Amino acid sequence: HGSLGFLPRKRASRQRGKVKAFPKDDASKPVHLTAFLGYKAGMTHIVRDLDRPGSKMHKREILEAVTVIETPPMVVVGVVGYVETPRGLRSLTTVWAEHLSEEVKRRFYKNWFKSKKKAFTKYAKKYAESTQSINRELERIKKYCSVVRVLAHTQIRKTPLAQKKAHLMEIQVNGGSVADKVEWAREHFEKTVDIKSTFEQNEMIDVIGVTRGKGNEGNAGYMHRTQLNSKIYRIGAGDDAKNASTDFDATEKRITPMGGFVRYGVVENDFVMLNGATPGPVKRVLTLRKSLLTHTSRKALEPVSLKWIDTASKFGHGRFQTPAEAKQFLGTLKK
Amino acid sequence: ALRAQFENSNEIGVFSNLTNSYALVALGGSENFYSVFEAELGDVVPVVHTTIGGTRIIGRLTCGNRKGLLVPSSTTDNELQHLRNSLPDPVKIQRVDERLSALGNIVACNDYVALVHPDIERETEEIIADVLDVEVFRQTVAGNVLTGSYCALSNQGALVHPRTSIQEQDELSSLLQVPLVAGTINRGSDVIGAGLVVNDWCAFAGLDTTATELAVCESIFKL
Amino acid sequence: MRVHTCYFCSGPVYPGHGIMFVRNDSKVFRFCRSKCHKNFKMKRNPRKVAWTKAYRKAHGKERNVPVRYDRNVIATTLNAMKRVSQVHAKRERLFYKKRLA
């Protein structure tokens, strides 16, 4: 058999990979976030210069397989205050935003269509009527609670996914005093937080998610897993047309490979490219978290400058990055 | 004669190539070898720490003289651009598409006369004559096709394998128009070119080269 | 970074893609895919193989000297590359129209 630290080998009790540990809080650092939620689209292979001192491929180039995760900006819909107790952390109270998008309202219902859409109705009414209760609760969190987690949901509509329920979750707000975290959450109420503001493509992060099920084996598969030290290679912007165009390559193109991502679609929003494989198949939600413990060796610290990113047809033996140059080489078709 | 050893190898000629106008050192290894080379020739001729074909065998892969240099066809486009940028404009750099890419191990060339391997291509010989501007002779050293590896050629003298006949050594010396000595370097290492590199005014030998070998090289090169 | 041309299909071969094969004559064959690698294996002549560029070429159907870096030269080369490709595309379209006629 395998390692005894992973048994009992049973199905994960959650579709979305839940964070089990957040980086330790620091008052010296100002107020920011630590985790983000994305959707796996697939991976390609890229050619990257190797600036690895002491290595035998120093000042050379290697080919690396890199997973692409679409990460549309996340909407902060609430905040949760946690108070330390002799029996552990306890959720003291929760404050939600006044207006919640249908994407996050669909989470509370198994049948949103048959529902009367009554979620947060009186909550929105009391929010508009009197703000003294909201002020009392926020003052309660900043005075008593020691850990602050913002409720954020993903804009699943932008992703080419048939699912319309947003994966609501909590992001621990590490940095500054408790009042600073509360002020940060209130300012960011109803707004959007971007992965460009959270991660910046040169740090060492961990990816967590549920693996894909292999059926029945002599149970094997569909288990919660935590990959450590997955390096971000590029946080590409969806709007920019140079997202998949490096400086050594030009050739204006998009990260979505020609022919589309297999069983996922076309990536149009901000995407994240991580070195190596990540758990879960395509179209499954993955969670990203910062480094709990600081460890930047040369591999985790060296800068990265991509040279060429493959966008060939992953469906089948693709042999052309873009239909433009495909038509330039291939003879003119009958159509 | 200067004693140096790249990493833990006494075959300095494998990891580096020496000419009368420029020097090349391996990339990705230890900077001590490059510093040692720069300490003796940095202020005289340029030294480029580059690689050919993504390997540290550039010394035995690249062959040339003070006028021009030749690189194997396996050299990358970026590598060739880096070499041209580092090397002076008067130092011509040309790529050779030969069946034996080991130019340094097949052909030994001086500033005036060059000896190539017996199976060198006519186009390669024409390119060598055009670039290096030297007379190319298709012969063999000590009966071995690897003339560039078994023989060391320079402007003031040449070194060959000690097993060669006296008449053969005299014929090679007359053909090369320079003195020739049949000896060994690095304590019996028969690959003189791999074990030692000699320029017009200086020579570099491995750390395992004996005192008698160093004295013989100094007498032959008159350095 | 060189995008090579396959021996058999004569198409563009990119890093990672295809297979590389070396002969005892030190001649190197690059294959754009397994199909073209296999097609070399039983030794089909590209010019007889219908979908190869060599067939489409010989059937009527269609720098070793390093250069010093110059920003102006690179910009001029990049600008001229698009125009050259556009001219080639127009010539191919006219050739296709002539072939159809």
Binding site: D247, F248, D249, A250, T251, K307, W308, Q321, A324, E325, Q328, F329 | D77, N78, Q81 | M1, R2, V3, P12, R63, V67, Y69, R71, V73, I74, T77, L78, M81, K82, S85
Partner: peptide, 17 residues
């Protein structure tokens, strides 16, 4: 100190300049 595009639009800019 500045970099140059090695290959663009399916053509090696370095090899065609």
């Amino acid at each position: 100190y500045d970099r140059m595009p090695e290959l663009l639009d399916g053509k090696n800019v370095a090899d065609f300049v």
